[PDB]
RNA sequence: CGGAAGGCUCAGUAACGGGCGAGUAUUUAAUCUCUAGAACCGGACAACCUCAGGAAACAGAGGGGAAAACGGAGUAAGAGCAUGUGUUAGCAUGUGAUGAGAACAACAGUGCAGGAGAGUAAGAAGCCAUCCCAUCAGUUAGUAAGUAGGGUAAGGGCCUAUUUAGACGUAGACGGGUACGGGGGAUUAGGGUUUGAUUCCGGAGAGGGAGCCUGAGAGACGGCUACCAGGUCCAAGG
RNA sequence: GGAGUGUGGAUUAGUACGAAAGGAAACCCACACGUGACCUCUGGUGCAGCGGGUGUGCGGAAGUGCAACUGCCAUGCUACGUCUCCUCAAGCAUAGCUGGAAGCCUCUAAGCUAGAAAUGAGUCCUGACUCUGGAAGACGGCCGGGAAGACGACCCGUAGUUAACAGCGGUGUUGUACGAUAUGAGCUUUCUAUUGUAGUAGCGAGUAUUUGAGACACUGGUUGUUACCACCGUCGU
RNA sequence: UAGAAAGCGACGCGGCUUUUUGAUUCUUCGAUGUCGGCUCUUCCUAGCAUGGCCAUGCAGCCGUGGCGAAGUGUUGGAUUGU
RNA sequence: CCUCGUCAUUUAAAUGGUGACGCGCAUGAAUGGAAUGACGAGAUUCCCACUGUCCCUACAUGUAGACUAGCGAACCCAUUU
RNA sequence: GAGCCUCUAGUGGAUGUUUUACACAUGUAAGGGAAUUCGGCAAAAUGGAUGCGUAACUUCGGGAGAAGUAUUGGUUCAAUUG
C-alpha cells in the first residue's frame, strides 16, 4: 500500500510505503476521517491528517458518499467523481466505483496534513511554492495588489505589480513579465461604444413619437375608417 | 478473531459459530443464528425489531456513520504564493501596498 | 453550430396505411420585413502544475485560472384571474406568480437580447375508396353518451368520480387467414384479366421486447439503461 | 467373554513384459460399514422462563380463568453432529536345508528354516479362593442432597467457604413494563361567567419519549439477618 | 493346432447325502394352532468375495483346474399372496 | 386349460392396468345380448397435492404401571423339575 | 335448541410418593417424499362466505361446489343495500 501525503501550506507532495502494521491501524477509517502521525510513525506526536480519497487495487476510485466497504455500479452524470463525458451532452453510464470504508482492497490512501507543527518532514516542510496562473478579473488583481477599497485606473497597478517584479524577483531584467491583462474594467474603446448606445436610444424615440403626430394630423378618423372590415 | 457481521442483525458473529447461505441469485450471506434467518423469510423489516443493532443505529440510540457529518478541514490566508514571485517579496510589497493605499 | 437529414429494407400493420379538400383546438432553432436593448457581483469545470492508481478499458488527491459558459442582485418586462369598454385585437382599472440581456473587429464588417406578422416543419382533425373464409351470427361494458375535474403544445374516455343504457350487425358486425399503400407495369380492336420489394410521395423498423436523458425537434440505436437469445478479450478481478 | 473388516486415490510408471495393441507389483492419504464413548459446535425437542392474538366470564384499565392457538428460548437428552479401532509366539498348505534306507539319488525315515484374514497369549470387559494394614470402640437407622437410581444399592454432607432469604458484583433468556406525557387518517362544536365579550372543548385504532426497559433464573464472589450441637438399635473390648 | 490325461472324457462300474418328491403307517383324533413375509440369534461346508500357495494351452492384463482354511462379508428395487 | 398367450402403450425394470387380435378347454341373445348418462361406506390401475408409512429414529405431555396405607380374588395342580 | 364461554337451579373421594422399562390416549421434527406394505392401512393436506372463470359426455333434466384462481382483522369516513 502506498500512501501520498500534500502539505496545503507548502505546496508540496510526497509518497511513501506503508508496513503492515501501519496499514492495519488505517483499517476501518473512513474519507474525511482524522488521526494523529503516531499511528502511522514512531514520532510524529501531534501532527495531525485527515483522509481525502484512493484507489482499489482493480484500480476503481474510492467515492466519498458511498458508506460501505464494497464495490456497486451506480449511473454517473457529467459534473459527478468516476466520470469523464465528453461527445455528447446529457450522457450517462453505468460504472464500477467503491464505498469509502477502507480494508485490505486498497493499493493508495491520499492524506493532507494539516499542519507540520514543530517536526520537520522531508520534502513537505524543505519547499515552499505558489500558483499557475495570474488573476485576470480587476477585483481579484486589486486585493493581490496590495490596495483595498479605493479607485484607481487599471495602469497604476499593472505598473505597481511589473515594477515590483523586476524589482523583487530579478532586481533587473526581461524574465519573469507574464502577460498581465485586465478584465472587467472600461478601457477607452469601451467607453466610446457605451457612448453610442446612448446615441441610437435617443434618435429612435423622437423619429418613432415625431411619425404619430404626422399621423394623427392627417387623420383624425384613424379608428373609424380603419376598423369597419 | 471472528467469522464476521451478521446481515439481518448488525451482530458481530463469534469464530466458529453461525452459517452461510447462499442463493441461486448467487450471493452468499453470513447469519448470527437460525432466529434471524427465519424472520428474513417471513420479511419482517430489521429495523422493527427493536433488540437488533441495526434498529438501535436507525433510531439514533447507538452512534453510527450516519450520525458523523463530517467536513473538510478549513485553513487559513498564506502570504501570496503567486508564480515567480518569492514568497519573502510579497511579505513585503503587500505591506508596501497597504500603505500606499491609506 | 451540426450529428433527428441523406443511405438501407419491407418484418409488423385491414389502419389517419391511401386519394381529394380545408387551415385549427396547437408548438416551431435557423431566415425575412417592421421594430428594437443605459445592469452589478461571485464561485467552479476542463486544460495547466506536483505527486500518482489499473492487465487493460478507464480513473484519483492537492493548488491556481477564464468566457458571449454558469449562478445570484437590482431592474425593465410579465402569465393567469376579475370588471368596464371595444366580435377581437387593443385600451382602462384592481391584483400578481415569475423574472432576464453579446458584443467584438475595423479592410472596413460580423454577431447576440426582447416583440408583432410572415416562411418552413410537425401534432390532431373532415369527406371518400379499400383483400379472402358463413364448415366464423351475434359482438362490445371505457364499451355508447352526459356533468365535473386532472393531464397535454393542444380537441377528445385521453384518464378518473357519480348519473343514463346505449353503440354495431345478413347492404356481413365480431373472429380467423393474408397484405407496406399509391403515382405506375405487362397483355390488350372494344369490354376486360393480371401484377406493383424496386429512380417520385407518404408510412414503419434497426437481434426481440420495454424504459429514457439532452435538445427547437428522438420514445434516436455508427446515444444511454435492464432483461431474453446469442457472441468477443482477459492478468479471472473485470 | 472378546473385534475391527473392506474399498479407492497417489507413487513405483506409461516402467518390466510384448511385433504391436495394450500393461502389472510395499510403505503414505481419503472414505464406507461395524464397535465403544461424548455435547465444545450444528440440527431436533420445549417440561422451567419471557412475549402475541381470537370467542366469552370477573363494572373500566391493570392483573387473570376456560376453550385452546401461536413467536422465541436456559439447563438436560439426542444424531442428521464430534472423537475412536495393534503387537507377539507356536505353526497349515506349500516351497526348501542337511540325510540314510539303497556306495548314486531323494523335503522325511531322526533332526532343522521360512510360512495364512486361521490358532494361543498381551493391551480390552467380568472378578473364585486369597494376600497386606489400622484401632476399644466400630457400624447401621433417623435428618438433608445427587454426578446415582424401579425398590434396595452407589456417591456424599450434618455447627460449616453449611442451608435459606436479601442487598452489591458476575453470567444468561425474552424484547422495551405500569403510569404519565406528547402526537395521530379523520369526525365534531360543547360548557361557564353574563347582552356583549371573555372563558371554552369532545371522540379515535395506532405511534414516539421516559426505557437494552421490566420480568425471570443460576452464581463453587462478597456483606447482613435467621435456623441447626440430638436420639434409637446391633456387634465387640 | 502336436499329443489319451493343460482342460475334457462317450460306453460301462462303485459310493455318499437327506436340502426334492415318492414309498410305508411306529407315536399323537377327552386337539402338539396349518403357507409366506417381518424381527432376531446361532450352527454346517460341498469356498461366491477377501488372505497364503500348486498346475497351466501361465509373456503382461484378464482367466481356468486344484490344496490348508468357516475370522469378516454377501445389498436397494419393478410385476406376483407366493 | 395350455398361460406369466402374441403385438402396442404406461415404468429404469411390469406374473399388474388400458388398447388391439381370436377355431372361444367350456362366449352368446327376457336361462336375456350389446353400447352410454346420473347415483354407489361396492371391486381394480394411474397422476397431482400431502405427509414419521419408510430411510432412522429422537424429545416432551396426561393415565396406568414400580415403591407405600386401607381392602382383597380366580384359572390351574401325580409332582421330587 | 351445532361447538365454545357465562346467569337461574343443581353437583364429586382406595393415601401417600416426581414416579425406570414396556404400554394406552395425544403433540412436534433437518434433508428426502410411498423407497414402506398384499394394499397409502393410519395420519397429513383441503375446508365458511364473496367474486371471477368453468371440459368430455348426456335420457337435455344434469355433469357442477367440475376443474383453476383471488379476497377476508382493527380504526375513521362516505353511500344507503349495491
Ligand atoms: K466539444
Ligand atoms: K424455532
Ligand atoms: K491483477
Ligand atoms: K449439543
Ligand atoms: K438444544
Ligand atoms: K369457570
Ligand atoms: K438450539
Ligand atoms: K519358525
Ligand atoms: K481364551
Ligand atoms: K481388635
Ligand atoms: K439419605
Ligand atoms: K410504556
Ligand atoms: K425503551
Ligand atoms: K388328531
Ligand atoms: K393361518
Ligand atoms: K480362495
Ligand atoms: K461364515
Ligand atoms: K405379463
Ligand atoms: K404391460
Ligand atoms: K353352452
Ligand atoms: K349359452
Ligand atoms: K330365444
Ligand atoms: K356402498
Ligand atoms: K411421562
Ligand atoms: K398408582
Ligand atoms: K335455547
Ligand atoms: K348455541
Ligand atoms: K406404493
Ligand atoms: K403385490
Ligand atoms: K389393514
Ligand atoms: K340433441
Ligand atoms: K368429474
Ligand atoms: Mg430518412
Ligand atoms: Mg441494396
Ligand atoms: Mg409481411
Ligand atoms: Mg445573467
Ligand atoms: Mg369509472
Ligand atoms: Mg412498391
Ligand atoms: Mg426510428
Ligand atoms: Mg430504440
Ligand atoms: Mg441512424
Ligand atoms: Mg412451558
Ligand atoms: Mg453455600
Ligand atoms: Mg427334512
Ligand atoms: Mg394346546
Ligand atoms: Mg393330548
Ligand atoms: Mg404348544
Ligand atoms: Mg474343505
Ligand atoms: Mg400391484
Ligand atoms: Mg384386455
Ligand atoms: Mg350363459
Ligand atoms: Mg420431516
Ligand atoms: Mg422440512
Ligand atoms: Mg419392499
Ligand atoms: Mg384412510
Given at each position: ?35 494523529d ?8 506526536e ?46 450517462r ?32 516542510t ?78 429612435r ?25 | ?11 458481530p ?17 453470513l ?20 433488540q ?51
Open positions: 500500500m502506498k500512501l501520498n501525503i500534500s502539505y496545503p501550506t507548502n505546496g508540496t507532495h510526497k509518497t511513501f510505503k506503508l508496513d503492515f502494521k501501519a496499514e492495519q491501524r488505517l483499517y476501518g477509517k473512513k474519507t474525511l476521517d482524522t488521526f502521525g503516531s499511528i502511522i510513525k514512531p514520532e510524529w501531534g501532527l495531525q491528517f485527515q483522509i481525502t480519497g484512493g484507489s482499489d487495487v482493480q484500480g476503481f476510485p474510492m467515492i466519498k458518499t458511498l458508506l460501505t466497504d464494497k464495490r456497486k455500479k451506480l449511473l454517473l452524470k457529467k459534473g459527478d467523481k468516476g466520470f469523464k463525458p465528453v461527445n455528447r451532452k446529457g450522457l453510464k453505468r460504472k464500477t466505483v467503491r464505498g469509502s470504508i477502507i480494508a485490505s482492497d486498497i493499493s493508495m490512501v491520499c492524506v493532507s496534513l494539516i499542519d507540520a507543527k514543530e517536526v520537520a518532514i522531508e520534502g513537505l524543505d519547499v515552499v511554492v505558489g500558483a499557475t496562473h495570474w488573476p485576470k478579473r480587476f477585483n481579484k488583481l486589486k486585493a493581490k495588489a496590495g490596495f483595498s477599497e479605493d479607485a484607481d485606473v487599471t495602469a497604476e497597478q499593472v505598473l505597481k505589480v511589473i515594477k515590483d517584479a523586476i524589482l523583487e524577483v530579478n532586481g533587473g531584467d526581461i524574465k519573469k513579465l507574464p502577460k498581465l491583462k485586465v478584465s472587467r474594467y472600461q478601457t477607452e474603446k469601451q467607453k466610446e461604444r457605451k457612448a453610442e448606445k446612448i446615441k441610437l436610444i435617443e434618435e424615440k423622437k423619429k418613432s413619437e415625431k411619425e404619430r403626430a404626422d399621423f394623427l394630423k392627417k387623420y383624425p378618423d384613424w379608428q373609424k375608417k380603419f376598423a369597419t372590415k | 478473531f471472528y467469522e464476521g457481521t451478521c446481515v439481518y442483525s448488525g451482530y458473529v463469534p469464530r466458529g459459530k453461525g452459517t452461510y447461505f447462499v442463493s441461486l441469485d448467487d450471493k452468499s450471506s447469519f448470527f443464528s437460525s432466529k434471524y434467518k427465519n424472520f428474513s423469510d417471513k420479511k419482517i423489516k430489521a429495523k422493527r425489531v427493536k437488533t443493532l441495526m434498529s438501535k443505529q436507525f433510531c439514533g440510540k447507538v452512534e453510527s456513520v450516519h450520525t458523523e457529518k463530517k467536513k473538510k478541514i478549513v485553513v487559513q490566508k498564506i502570504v501570496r504564493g503567486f508564480p515567480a514571485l518569492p514568497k519573502d517579496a510579497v511579505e513585503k510589497i503587500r505591506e508596501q501596498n497597504k500603505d500606499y493605499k491609506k
